[PDB]
Amino acid sequence: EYPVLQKILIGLILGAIVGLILGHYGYADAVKTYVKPFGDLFVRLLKMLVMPIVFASLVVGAASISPARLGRVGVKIVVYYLLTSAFAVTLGIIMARLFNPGAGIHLAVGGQQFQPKQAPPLVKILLDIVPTNPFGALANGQVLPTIFFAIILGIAITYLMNSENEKVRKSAETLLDAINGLAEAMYKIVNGVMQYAPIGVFALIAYVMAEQGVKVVGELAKVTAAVYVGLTLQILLVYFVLLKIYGIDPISFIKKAKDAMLTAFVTRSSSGTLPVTMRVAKEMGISEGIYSFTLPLGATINMDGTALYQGVCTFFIANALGSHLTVGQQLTIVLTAVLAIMLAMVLESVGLPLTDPNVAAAYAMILGIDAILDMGCTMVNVTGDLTGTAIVAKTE
Amino acid sequence: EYPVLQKILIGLILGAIVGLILGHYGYADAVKTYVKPFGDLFVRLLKMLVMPIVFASLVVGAASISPARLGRVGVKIVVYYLLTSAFAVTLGIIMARLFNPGAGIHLAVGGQQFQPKQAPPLVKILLDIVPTNPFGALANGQVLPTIFFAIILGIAITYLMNSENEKVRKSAETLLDAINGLAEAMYKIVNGVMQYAPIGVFALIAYVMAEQGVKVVGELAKVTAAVYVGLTLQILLVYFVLLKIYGIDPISFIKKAKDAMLTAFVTRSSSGTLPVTMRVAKEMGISEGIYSFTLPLGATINMDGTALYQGVCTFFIANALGSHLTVGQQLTIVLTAVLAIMLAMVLESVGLPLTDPNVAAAYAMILGIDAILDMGCTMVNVTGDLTGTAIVAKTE
Amino acid sequence: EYPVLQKILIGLILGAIVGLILGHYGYADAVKTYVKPFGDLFVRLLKMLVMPIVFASLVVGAASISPARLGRVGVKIVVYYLLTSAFAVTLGIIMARLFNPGAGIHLAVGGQQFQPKQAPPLVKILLDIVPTNPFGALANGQVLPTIFFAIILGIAITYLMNSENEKVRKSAETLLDAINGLAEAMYKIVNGVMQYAPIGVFALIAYVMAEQGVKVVGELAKVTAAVYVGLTLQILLVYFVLLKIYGIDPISFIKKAKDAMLTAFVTRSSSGTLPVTMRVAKEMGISEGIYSFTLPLGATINMDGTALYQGVCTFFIANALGSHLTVGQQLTIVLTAVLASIGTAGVPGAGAIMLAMVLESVGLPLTDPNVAAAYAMILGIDAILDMGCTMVNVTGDLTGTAIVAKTE
Ligand code: NA
Ligand code: NA
Ligand code: NA
Ligand code: NA
């Protein structure tokens, strides 16, 4: 029972208090063994739905809209995603210079060491979008390859709804219907899973705050302000701005996106949030044609929030090492950060690799409050996707 | 052609004779290379059907019955399963004290050594019931996670058969129908696979008897009598008793369950028997709502037969080591044996670990006649499931 | 736009020229990093369709035809496959004695060494046809186990279309329809993928020719002529012959099979070609009952082209080692090469790796330092030899289907 958009807010506020307090008294362990499992059951239940929903929804949606309309949606959302992600870095740099995170600090070296995994060739990453076995792609995670096949099937069904034959048209009928059955059924499930969300949300930040809340002091606090005040501006100064521009109401969009935003914040999984991010798209009544393609692709490609975190970390490390960056170095961040634990790749691009003993001991502090910084980031990550879909949907 | 509940019995009796004799003359190898493959083809053909049947049947069954009725079935069958499994251990201990398996024996030490795999945390095992990717769960074995998703889908379909919409209700219609198609088709297959059963049943015990039949002498025979006479009592003294109590006829239940019992006995796979265990449930006309949930869950959770084997082995090892067990130690078995090659976990609970050189050399003999003991166990394992379903079904 | 059976031929002829030339100037690297990815995208897009098509098509096809008719098709196509594969070896031996590949050569020893993976027991390979988890079989490759379950399901649907019940018959209706939906949809996709074929075909042989074209000189050329002239005879002297015999027109069959043949040639994947091999079967209007069973089984079992390659290599190695083979040794090849083309895989080159099993049968194992250094040269021009082989491999399947289809 009870209005559930409040139960979540109650759980979230009450969770932060029960969190920060328990952990400060040394119950960092206690929370992990007792409370966290309830927060995990929530995450599990959401991940459960991702594969059926993304696939099933997209076959229907791609079979619903024109193969021309879809491409135009595609090119629009990508142009949108890159520009928002670029804007988010330059806004993070502005925060990292507005604040001075780790400016005066001279930290303890040689404690921790790192070796980043070197990223796979671009050619191989693009070819891998085309899956060599659909049932394989579905079986093990793999959002992007699934997206591809779902559209290739979506378009295939539509061309069968036209055949000069009756029995051909009658089979493509039932298949596209059955797939929709699943898509309908899956959305229905999230409505029930969101019922357990209060308990999950409470439990989930109860853990984040107990484990890493206490570590948010000193220079490791100034970075947190830098990230959050920056993330706030990505919402007000970039989304609210582009929503007004495109004839949408910012306030009633935030009203409708409330669930996807808090799941994304609590869960830290842009991907694990997808069923909720997607339901909220259907809630505000965006075309299944558009949102079933833009949101799963954006769950992977559009990370405005994270792109900001990468900007404000590249400045934390630079300040702690004790050498500032110029116009030619700062712009080298923005490009690499768009093109990109993968912060390890935008750190070599400026000239301070992660293997470097003192760089590595500085990054060790940052990774120490990561789950705190990553809540805010994942929310703005996900919000950025809904904003893009809403804009592309307005222009069809 | 020919009445097939006889061809199986012929194959089973003729198999034991051709088995015990061939192996006693040294053809333990010959049977393995020539006969066994035919027995394997049977097991393969049954495992083949497990995944489609369990999933497809359960979506239909859970979409058929009330979400309230199902939970009441759930709580009833679990309460039944634990109590039957508890009863089976205390009956195995009674047999292990009635007989004296390995009492006087002092066996050869240092021959064989063991190291048991330490079981995964409980928290992680319960969370793992909720699958993170259904298509994944289906792809690789995994009965329990599938069970969960099948019901979550089953309940979802039913809530779509109610929607104020026509096209929504029409898609959930076709999906639930198609899934039923599979479920219907799969049951039909087992009817043909049971046609090959005679050849398989013959071949299968021909191997068990040739390989391990000769080893059933001495103290390793007294344990076999202790297990089988004990298992006999679990059927007559526990199942026949609870069937009469609940207004079912014991004799015509054994008549209907005949196929699932002999498959389970010959095949040693409680899970591999499932398509037959399930068909026999539909044969006696139990609701697809009930049996499609109770039987696959019971295929994993309810092992009365094995729980007895664990009781009478914990006493074989104790007698061979030469120290008896008290009331506080015997009750420590019953609890751990309910809560549990996993015999290695109920052996540490009494205080005689499996790593211990002389414990390990004693367990080596027991594992030497395992396939003999395991035939009877798996039968009672599977029987116990049908009995539970029949009882819960009577009380709806 | 544009007639696409030409765009492929243009790409194929223009590819060989842009290939052989770029590689001879040292751009073997340049082609691999720039051109090949385009040829890969084609291969990827075809493999993509294999699993849905083979399964979906076969459930429909097996639910369409009589369980008696299917068995008779089964026994006919297998009898055909073995006899064609046997004929292909004895034709390869004839070419390996007609030509003398590596007769006078005495090659550099101790350069390269090999150790072949020992093949799994027959019992275990036959039992493995029956899959223990269908969804598992579908998930990871596995053509043969899928074939089995698709038929077992196909037959099951048909027995449900008969039930005294209405709601039972109505569900088996929708399921068999939905599966057909996929099967229909999947064939429709290959029609679009074949649109990208020109670019792929061009890119694909551009690579084969740049990488291995230059190595086709000397004794390594005489073997290539021996293979290709042999493969040509398998088509004219064996397929054209058996097609006429069975009241089919050879020329208009080659016309209809054109796409599957060039995909198979360019792609080197008998399995990867399957969606095209299958579409071409529906194009010439063979019963979905027959081709949906014969072609995927034949994609793995019937490798006439490869069986010839195994015959003409067993003679290249024998001549290079410097000891000829007798009647009792040559017939020991034909039997083992059939029994190893029955088990050879349907993927780029990995058939020319089971040649290691038909080399021990004559008495010259692959571990032997000078045998291994001779096989090293052969594997050096494998992608050239394997193009032709895979084409004749795939063609042989269509020929068999057409023959069995004529006799229903
Ligand atoms: Na995102
Ligand atoms: Na059981
Ligand atoms: Na082939
Ligand atoms: Na083969």
Please spell the DSSP secondary structure of B230-267, one letter per residue: HHHHIIIIIIHHHHHHTT--HHHHHHHHHHHHHHHHHH
- Distance between CA C267 and CA C259 in Å, rounded? 12
Q: How far apart are CA B354 and CA B113, in angstroms?
A: 8
Can you read off the two tokens belonging to residue A9? 């807010």
For residue C292, which of C59, C47, C60, C58 has the smallest C-alpha distance? C58
Cα dihedral across residues A85, A88, A93, A99: positive or negative: negative
Kindly report the nearest CA distance between residue B177 and chain A, in angstroms: 9
Asked if C139's CB is within 8 angstroms of B139's CB, the reply is: yes
User: Which of B147, B180, B393, B160 shows the shortest CA–CA distance to B293?
Assistant: B147
Which pair of tokens denotes residue A116?
Answer: 């980043």
Phi/psi region, residue B63 (left: phi>0; alpha: psi -120 to 50; beta: rest), is alpha
- Nearest CA to B290 out of B55, B53, B65 is that of B65
Which residues of A fall within a CB distance of 8 Å from B56? none
CA Rg value for chain A? 22
In the DSSP assignment, the letter for residue B91 is: H
Q: Please give the Cα distance from C93 to C226 (Å, whole number).
A: 9
d(CA B393, CA C187): 47
Q: Cβ(A59)–Cβ(C178) under 8 Å?
A: no
Reference B37, options B206, B262, B241; nearest CA is B206
Mutate to test the interface with C, among A142, A171, A177 (most CBs of C within 10 A): A171
Length of chain A: 396
Token digits of residue A259: 């669930």
Residue A140 structure tokens? 């093990």
**Cβ contact A156–C185 (<8 Å):** yes
The Cα-based distances of C93 to A83, C100, C219, C341 in angstroms read 65, 11, 17, 15
Taking CA atoms, A300 is separated from A145, A275, A296, A306, A384, in Å, by 12, 14, 7, 11, 12
Euclidean distance between CA atoms C172 and C156, whole angstroms: 9
Collapse the DSSP code of C186 into the 3-class scheme (helix H, G, I; strand E, B; otherwise coil) and give the result. helix
Region of residue C18 (left: phi > 0; alpha: psi -120 to 50; beta: else) = alpha
Number of domains into which chain B is organized:
1
**Using CB atoms, which chains have 3+ pairs under 8 A with B?**
A, C
Residue numbers in C near B189 (CB within 8 A): 152-153, 156
Option in B127, B133, B173 nearest A37 (CB): B127
- For residue B296, the ligand closest to its alpha carbon is 2
Hey, CA dihedral for A283, A289, A290, A294, is it positive or negative? positive
Distances (CA, A) of B151 to A43, B159, B277, B292, C379: 19, 12, 20, 10, 54
Q: What's the token pair of residue C407?
A: 């006799």
| Intra-chain end-to-end CA distance of chain A, in Å | 38
Q: Which two tokens stand for residue B152?
A: 């979550």
Pairwise CA distance, residues C226 & A308, whole Å? 64
- The dihedrals phi and psi of C216, each to the nearest 5 degrees, come to -85, 60
**Close Cβ partners of C279 (under 8 Å, ≥ 6 residues apart):** C187, C190, C191, C259, C260
Question: What b/e string do you get for B317-352 counting C-beta neighbours within 10 Å, with b at 16 or more?
Answer: bbbbbeeebeeeebebbbebbbebeebbbbbebbeb
**Residue among C130, C151, C142, C133 at smallest CA distance from B50:** C133
CB atoms within 10 A of CB C108: 11
Query: Which positions ≥6 away from A134 have C-beta within 8 Å?
Result: A146, A149, C48, C51, C52
Distances from the Cα of B189 to the Cα of A293, B283, B368, angstroms: 40, 15, 36
The region that residue C141 occupies, defined by phi over 0 for left and psi between -120 and 50 for alpha, beta otherwise, is left
Question: For residues C345 and C269, is the Cβ–Cβ distance under 8 A?
Answer: no
User: Residue B198 sits in which domain range?
Assistant: 1-396
Copy the structure tokens of residue B336: 């751990």
Asked if residues A120 and A342 have their Cβ atoms less than 8 Å apart, the reply is no
| CB of C111 closer than 8 Å to CB of C373 | yes
For residues C312 and B284, what is the distance between their CA atoms, to the nearest angstrom? Answer: 64
Is B126 exposed, middle or buried (CB count within 10 Å of its CB: 0-12, 13-18, 19+)? exposed
Burial of B247 per CB tally in 10 Å (0-12, 13-18, 19+): exposed
Residue of B233, B291, B244 lying closest to B57 (CA atoms): B291
User: Could you tell me the end-to-end alpha-carbon distance of chain B, in angstroms, rounded to an integer?
Assistant: 38
Q: Which of A156, A173, A174 sits opposite C189 (nearest CB)?
A: A156
Of B157, B155, B3, B196, nearest in space to B70 by CA: B155
Where residue A351 falls (left for φ over 0; alpha for ψ -120 to 50; beta otherwise) is left
How many angstroms is it from C306 CA to the middle of ligand 4?
Answer: 9
d(CA B149, CA C390): 44
User: Alpha-carbon Rg of chain C, whole angstroms?
Assistant: 22
Match 């307090």 to its residue by tokens: A21
- Given the structure tokens 């750190």, which residue do they identify? A347
Class of residue A325 by CB neighbours under 10 A (exposed 0-12, middle 13-18, buried 19+): buried
- In SS3 terms, B305-363 reads as HHHHHHHHHHHHHHHHHCCCCCHHHHHHHHHHHHCCCCHHHHCCCCCCCCCCHHHHHHH
Nearest CA-CA distance, residue C227 and chain B, Å = 40
Q: What are the backbone dihedrals phi and psi of residue A248, each rounded to the nearest 5 degrees, phi first?
A: -115, 155
Among the partner residues A140, A141, A185, nearest to B156 by beta-carbon distance? A185
Tracing tokens 């050569």 back to the chain, one arrives at C105
Residue of A33, A40, A50 lying closest to B127 (CB–CB): A40
Q: Rounded to an integer, what distance in angstroms lies between the CA atom of residue C203 and that of residue C32?
A: 10
Of C185, C223, C196, C176, the residue nearest C317 (C-alpha): C223
CB C269 within 8 Å of CB C390 = yes
What CATH number did the domain enclosing A77 receive? 1.10.3860.10
Helix (H) or strand (E) holding C383: helix C382-406
Residue identified by tokens 């990093």 is C33
Asked if B382 and B277 touch (Cβ cutoff 8 Å), the reply is: yes
Chain B residues in contact with A37 by the CB 8 A cut-off are 123, 127
Residue in the structure block whose two tokens are 């023959």: C403
Instruction: Mark which residues 95-134 of A lie under 8 Å from C by CB.
Output: 123, 127, 130-134
Task: Compute the distance between CA of residue B115 and CA of residue B222 in angstroms, rounded to an integer.
Answer: 27
Counting ligands in written order, the one closest to the CA of B302 is 2
How far is the C-alpha of B256 from the C-alpha of B259, rounded, in Å? 8
Closest partner residue to B48 (CB to CB) among C123, C132, C171 is C132
Of A276, A304, A281, A300, the residue nearest A292 (C-alpha): A281
CA separation for the pair A166, A359 (Å, rounded): 68
CA angle at A342 for the pair A337 and A343, rounded to the nearest 5°: 60
Burial of B41 (0-12, 13-18, 19+ CB in 10 A): buried
How many cross-chain Cβ pairs, A to B, lie less than 8 Å apart?
75
Nearest-Cα distance to chain C for A163, in Å, is 10
Chains touching C, CB cut-off 8 Å, 3+ pairs: A, B
Q: Is A181 close to B159, i.e. CB distance below 8 A?
A: no
CB C6 within 8 A of CB C197: no
Cβ atoms B57, B182 nearer than 8 A: no
Closest residue, chain A, to C143 (C-alpha)? A133
Any idea what DSSP says for residue C71?
Answer: H
Query: How many helices and strands in chain B, by DSSP H and E?
Result: 18, 0
Query: What are the distances in angstroms from CA C226 to CA B125, B277, B359?
Result: 62, 60, 68
Q: Find out whether A191 is annotated in a ligand binding site.
A: no
> CA dist A215 to A35, A226, A308, Å?
20, 16, 21
- For chain B, the C-alpha Rg in angstroms (whole number) is 22
Asked whether the beta carbons of A152 and A170 are under 8 A apart, the reply is no
For residue B172, the distance in angstroms to the closest alpha carbon of chain C comes to: 12
Q: Tokens 């069937």, residue?
A: B243
What are the structure tokens assigned to C130, written together?
């029956």
